[PDB]
Structures are given as structure tokens and as C-alpha cells.
Design a protein around this ligand. Sequence first.
Ligand SMILES: OC[C@H]1O[C@H](O[C@H]2[C@H](O)[C@@H](O)[C@@H](O)O[C@@H]2CO)[C@H](O)[C@@H](O)[C@@H]1O
Ligand SMILES: OC[C@H]1O[C@H](O[C@H]2[C@H](O)[C@@H](O)[C@@H](O)O[C@@H]2CO)[C@H](O)[C@@H](O)[C@@H]1O
Length: 490
Amino acid sequence: NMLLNYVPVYVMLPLGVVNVDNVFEDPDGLKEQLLQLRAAGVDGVMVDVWWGIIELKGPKQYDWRAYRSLLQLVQECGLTLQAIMSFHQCGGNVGDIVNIPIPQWVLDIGESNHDIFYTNRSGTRNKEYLTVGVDNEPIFHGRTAIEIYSDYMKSFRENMSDFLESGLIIDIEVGLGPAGELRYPSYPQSQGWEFPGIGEFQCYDKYLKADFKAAVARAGHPEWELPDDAGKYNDVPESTGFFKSNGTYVTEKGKFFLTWYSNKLLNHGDQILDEANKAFLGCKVKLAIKVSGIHWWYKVENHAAELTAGYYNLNDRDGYRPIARMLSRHHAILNFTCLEMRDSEQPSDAKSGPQELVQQVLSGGWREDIRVAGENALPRYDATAYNQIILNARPQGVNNNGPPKLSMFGVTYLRLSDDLLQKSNFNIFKKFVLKMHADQDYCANPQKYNHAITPLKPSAPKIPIEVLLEATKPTLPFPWLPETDMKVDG
Ligand SMILES: OC[C@H]1O[C@H](O[C@H]2[C@H](O)[C@@H](O)[C@@H](O)O[C@@H]2CO)[C@H](O)[C@@H](O)[C@@H]1O
Ligand SMILES: OC[C@H]1O[C@H](O[C@H]2[C@H](O)[C@@H](O)[C@@H](O)O[C@@H]2CO)[C@H](O)[C@@H](O)[C@@H]1O
């Protein structure tokens, strides 16, 4: 049956649907929009559950009222929900039309200890997320950053138990960094970064610096220092000593640093996911993390932008599969956030390979046998974008004799806006949804298309870093069709 080729479609809700004062502003307005989505066949929606709004008053001072009202409305409208545990700030990244800081009480601590923030070589502190450096530092009124994230998720589970039991929530996206993605904030618009700048390493806070220094001493090179020749945000790789041909990134020192730098993220995600699994143990939901799509400089040997973001990916070292393997012990979904771009849409001097990057990441996931999902990075309403998303959702097309050998677990569209509901735009969107569903009508019961959700099981045993890094071995991607067999047209 064709229904087995069905890929669910989700739509992100507007940023700030519940304001910074913890008020669900316009229920009636959202309702009309939600009803529009329901009639269009959309399976569900995605929303940020902002840590800065909910635990604003103080440690463990949670107020879930506004969000309960939102979830209630989503349920009445017949849609499922992907809830994001948003432990980051809204405001400094692309598309952020509203400012939502992390808890003020945490910010207060940052006033006396600026090292709780990601810091660049020049000393600028980025306040959008707590540095992985303090994950296990008990400096937040007795709690460590990970304990804060853990308590938050447990309180969410307990206070939203009725919604979880009714099966409203499809998956829990655990924010792991800027924009909720597992990465370092290497390309901060707030600091003047501009596409396609290579970005900057963000390992200069006192905690990471101390860890690095101890690490190199144990490796037998206590004299090694953090990179000092990687240039600045808007540089080009060839103009730096670190990323140029035969540069520092290829030396024993550079390789050690890069491994250390990227390993911190793997451990960051792995440990917080352990907490997320405990908090939702037994609940009928799945866990997911977000991986940023850094396609610029992907076509040159140095992969500069990826390296500064924490993805140690080169042509002879897969920096993404290790993440997928890490996710398998948690039975988690890898949500890749850049799925709609084509190489020809990027200026040529940016050396962008979004299409090749996608193929590498998705293949890695299916290779490791984990579920892969995705989102479009930028607002798009044209058929070319939709056709590209549909192509990546089912790389080898539909199978009339059963399930496709390869398919994504789901796609979340960014974002719900009045522009989307405009007659013509919404018309095309409806076709996109239809094709994602493989020409089948909306299907209410996920079990029909082999997406039944069972109670979350405890994570499998910890996988040692060495076994994880074995996944760096380059593999050939699965074959992609040149264009989808389920085009939207027009
Ligand atoms: O982390 C947010 C967002 O960053 C990237 O989006 C890029 C985009 O690819 C470029 O074309 C350009 O417009 O700059 C954007 C960043 O400001 C990632 O591609 C995306 O996955 C991620 O969510
Ligand atoms: O509301 C979700 C998320 O949206 C924005 O970040 C996006 C980014 O704009 C896109 O590139 C995308 O597909 O991935 C990111 C995460 O989904 C906001 O900047 C972020 O704060 C918010 O959590």
C-alpha cells in the first residue's frame, strides 16, 4: 500500500506565540490559523518551550499555565506536537523577530562569572547559551547546568502528563545549543558575522581553556595553546594560517585541538540526552536533537565553517556519523535543519554544497540505523524548494510494492506566517503536503504508515568515545535520484 511511503509534515508555530511575560497572547488568532493547517492535511506543529519564560522567577520557579493553554488548543484542533526544550535565547539568529533571553537569575550569575558563556578569542561573551564548559559545574545556586536542564524536563513531563498520555506530543526536541542546535555559536550575527564568513572557534571561556590545557599536558604537549591563527568571523579560509593549505588544522597540534573541540559536543549531547531519557522514561514519545546545516566551505578541503561550529568533518573524516551513532543508544531522531537548498542557489565564492552535505548526513543516519528528520533553513514558498525537500524525504522515490528503502521520519516546515496562508502560497503548500503524503489523504493514525510510537525505553549502555570515533571512517552515500518522482509542479 502507498500509505507506507507517507512522510509526516509538521509546521513550526510563530516565535513568541507565548510572550516573554508568559502569556498566550492571541488564542483566537492562532486557532483560525491552526484550523487552516488541519484542513490542509498537516500532521502536527512544532513549538519552542522557552526556558527563559518558564523558569524566569527563580530556580525551580516554573509556570506552565500559558503552555498548558496552548497545548490544549493544539489538541482541540486535531494536530500533534513536537515540543522543543528551548534552553537558548531567541533574538540573535536569522529570522528571530522577538527577544527571549535565558532566565534572568542565570544572567545575574553571569554578571559575576562571565565564563558561563561561550567566549571567542577576543573575549566577547555570547549570552544565548551556557557553555558546555559549565555542564557539570555546580555554580548555579547549587545546581550544574545539566541538572537545571534535567529538572526542567522532569517538571515538563509531570505537569504535562495528561497531554503526554493522550498522545498529543509526538517527539521531544532537546535543545543543545544556539538555536537549539548541537553546535558552538561560531557564526553570530550579533557579533557582526556575515554569510559566508568562516566563523570563529568558541572555546575561550576559562572552563574550556583549562580543560584544553590539562588535555594537551596529558598528551605530552603542555605548551600547546588554543588556535591563534584562525582569523576572524568574516575571513576566508585561505587568508588564515589555520585553514590554509598545509595549515595548522593539518598538524598534530591542530588535529588534537579539533578532536577535543568536537568531542566536547558529542559528550555534551550524550549526557543531556541521558537526562532527557530519564525524564520521559515510559512516555509514548521519541527524543530528537537538531544538527545545523553548515554548507558553506563544504566544497573546499578545510571545511572551515563546519570545523568552527564543532563538526569535525573533512573529506577523509566523517564528522557527522559519530553523532548518529551516539544517538542510537538513545533511540533518538537526528533532525537536520537545512533540507531545501540547491547548490546553484548559493553564490559561487561561498563554496557551498548543501545538496552533498544533506546526502552525507542522511546516509550516515540510515547507515547507523537511526531515524532521520529535517527542516528547511530559510522561508521558502516556491515549488523548487518543496520539490527538493520531497526529494530528500524519499531519495529513491516511492515504492509501489511496499515501504521505500529509504525515507525520512518527518519534515518540519518553517514557519507559520500570514505569508504562508496567502492564497497562492497556501495553494502550493497543499500540494507539497499531498506529495509528502505520497498522494494519500491525511492519515490520523501513525500506525497505518508504520510510525506507531511505543513507550520510551531506557537508553542503551554508554558507548565509549573510541567506538564513537570509529564512525569517522568515510563511507559512500546512498544513491540519490536526480529529481523526485512526486513533483509539486508550478
Ligand atoms: O543556526 C541557524 C541556521 O544556520 C544556518 O543557516 C544559514 C543559511 O544556510 C545560509 O544560507 C545563510 O542565510 O545564513 C544562515 C545562518 O544565519 C544553517 O544552514 C541552518 O541549518 C541553521 O538552522
Ligand atoms: O522555532 C524553532 C527555532 O527556529 C529558529 O532557528 C532555526 C533556524 O531559523 C532554521 O535554520 C532552522 O531550520 O533551524 C533552527 C532550529 O529549528 C530560531 O532561531 C530558534 O531560536 C528556534 O528554536
